[model samples]
Target: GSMDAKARNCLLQHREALEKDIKTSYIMDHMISDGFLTISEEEKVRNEPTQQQRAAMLIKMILKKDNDSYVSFYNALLHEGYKDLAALLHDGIP
Candidate 1:
């Protein structure tokens, strides 16, 4: 089976937009908590990797019996405020 290239491209663009929304919402919420008005576009989620992609890299470190990758990935997400995705993963797995 083959997907029409145009349709695939559109879907990819839509997914990118959704990811942006998630991050912008996350950042806005974070800033509001600390009494800030704005997050610049550059300071927002630009070029941020998807949570699942980050998770897979973390899992890879487990396969190699080294915890650095997993720890760093977890910490970065926590610090950068992707806790919603983390909670979703926890709930889904549990």
Candidate 2:
């Protein structure tokens, strides 16, 4: 239960903001145009995922795309007041 400490911290720090950004940046921008979700599906899915689960899924999706995605994801973190987490992501980019 306590295994995901980093995840727990990140959620505790920015759950609402992170979810909002994920909706705007990842879901609306990409998934819609990519046809990953229909309007009805988007409505359902948006109400479904917990913030932590959604954050992990979105981050994984972003990373899978390309390195540039990491920059976008990091900006989401920064925008949500998670500068420390954003910095950690940056540090890992070597």
Candidate 3:
């Protein structure tokens, strides 16, 4: 494990739509605030070219902190009225 650290392949299994459909609208700001989005990404991910790419980047950063950090993603879905994505997450996990 000297390369650094590792995280969930369980989550990575859905990388396609996880990165593709991150286009979840203005709930973007809501999750940003609710999650606090650790300031480290304030530079790397925040300067992103698109909201979807920014979201996708955070998905990468978040999972690294442990699946727990991504609870916010699924958390955002429900509060954002995305029962569609929320349901999948309810099963797939954070």
Candidate 4:
């Protein structure tokens, strides 16, 4: 089962802005290495033809995961220099 809505809502609320700003390239590996992203999930998101679509897919995946997964995603954003994007999800950190 998924975690609370506190963090998921952060992603849901910023869906439009996030897709436009996310790099996708930087945080993809981070999530996978941390086990926050599953191989099947990564493959699905990777298959998206466009960067925006890729990001959309990734965010949707995260929305269904646990709280720690959300924190992993948040940290990955900051560590990759996507502070602006990280800020969008910051308030939801558990």
Q: Please name the candidate that would achieve the greatest TM-score relative to the true structure.
A: 4
lDDT tens digits by residue: candidate 2, 1-94: 2213443344345544554444433443454554443455445445555755655555434433433444444555566456665554554442
Q: lDDT tens string, model 1, 8-80?
A: 3333344433344243434334444544322342233333467544333323222332233223333444667
Q: Considering only N, C-alpha and C atoms within 3 Å, which residue pairs clash in candidate 1?
A: none
Order of models, best TM-score first: 4, 3, 2, 1
Better of 1 and 4 by TM-score: 4
How many collisions per candidate?
Answer: 0, 0, 0, 0
Worst 10 residues of 4 by lDDT: 1-10
Pairs in steric clash, model 3: none
Number of the top-ranking candidate, with lDDT as the measure? 4
RMSD of 2: 8.0
- For candidate 3, give the lDDT of residue 56: 81
The per-residue C-alpha lDDT of model 4 at residue 52 equals: 93
- What's the true lDDT of residue 71 in model 3? 63
| Residue 18, candidate 2: C-alpha displacement in angstroms | 9.7
Instruction: Give the CA lDDT, 0 to 100, for residue 68 in model 1.
Output: 33
* Stretches of candidate 2 exceeding 4 Å from the true structure: 1-47
Candidate 4 residues 5-79, lDDT tens each?
Answer: 777777788889888878776787888887787788888988999999999988888888888888888888889
- Whose TM-score is higher: candidate 3's or candidate 4's? 4
Candidate 3 runs further than 4 Å off: 1-7, 24-28
TM-score of candidate 3 versus the correct structure, residues matched by position: 0.63
The residue pairs found clashing in candidate 2 are none
